[PDB]
């Protein structure tokens, strides 16, 4: 039923404002010229870096804890999609764990534009190119975040779509090391109703855009792949960064 599906997609929307303070609206008002509030700071060299603090191995020691209060905000809100929590709990960590990181991806475009990323809950904005130029290892981990962002952004999706998008990666049922997949994959189909409902009804013009979500969801697996195996060279050749417990945990059997 189509009045199902809306009350569905309202209540994600609700949980999806509730677990993740910083939203695409809010983003992008502040990456345009929209909001008259304040102007974000922009890092766009080492100096504008220090000024900011009152060098790669601490920008993503900084991601990495964001990447961690972003594992509570997704854990926060994937016990709010209406099933998970009868689930079977060893299958509720398995979503989570291969999940998670796609998510962050997802959401991460919100906050990305071929220009930069926001940073500091909106308060800022580090250049891509100043991440480019971590020619050490490190500046091979954004490039193609962006690149991929750049095209995800094009599908012009906001967080109406994107709170049942997030639903659907999380209710996989296609992940290693899952018990009882069916009832997983029950939850999902119902989810996927709802987003071809919600772009249909949010994205006239925009035809097939189920379709295009659908390919970028594969394309998604990529990017963790890269960003894991990428991630295989740093705990080999570059020792002096190390990894939080719950993400090395999180990266354990890929
Ligand atoms: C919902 C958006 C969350 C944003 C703020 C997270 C910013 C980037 O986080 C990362 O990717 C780092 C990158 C390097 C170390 C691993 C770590 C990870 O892969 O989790």
Redesign the pocket.
């Known amino acids: 039923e189509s009045a199902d599906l809306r009350a569905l997609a309202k209540h994600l929307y609700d949980s999806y404002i509730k677990s993740?303070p910083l939203t695409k609206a809010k983003a992008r008002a502040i990456l345009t010229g929209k909001t008259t509030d304040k102007s974000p700071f922009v890092i766009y060299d080492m100096n504008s870096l220090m000024m900011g603090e009152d060098v790669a191995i601490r920008i993503?020691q900084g991601?990495?804890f964001?990447?961690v209060?972003?594992v509570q905000?997704?854990t926060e809100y994937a016990k709010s999609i209406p099933g998970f929590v009868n689930l079977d709990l060893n299958d509720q960590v398995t979503l989570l764990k291969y999940g998670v990181?796609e998510?962050?991806?997802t959401?991460?475009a919100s906050?990305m534009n071929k220009d930069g990323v926001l940073?500091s809950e909106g308060q800022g904005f580090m250049t891509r190119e100043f991440l480019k130029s971590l020619r050490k290892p490190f500046g091979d981990?954004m490039e193609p975040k962006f690149e991929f962002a750049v095209k995800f952004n094009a599908l012009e999706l906001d967080d109406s779509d994107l709170a049942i998008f997030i639903a659907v990666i999380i209710l996989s049922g296609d992940r290693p090391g899952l018990l009882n997949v069916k009832p997983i994959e029950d939850i999902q189909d119902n989810l996927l109703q709802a987003l071809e409902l919600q772009l249909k009804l949010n994205h006239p013009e925009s035809s097939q855009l189920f379709a295009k979500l659908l390919q970028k969801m594969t394309d998604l697996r990529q990017i963790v792949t890269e960003?894991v195996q990428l991630?295989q060279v740093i705990k080999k050749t570059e020792t002096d960064?190390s990894?939080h417990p719950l993400?090395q945990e999180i990266y354990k059997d890929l």
Do not use: P
């Open positions: 993740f993503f991601c990495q964001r990447s209060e972003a905000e997704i990181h998510i962050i991806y959401m991460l906050l940073i981990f960003h991630l960064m990894l993400l």
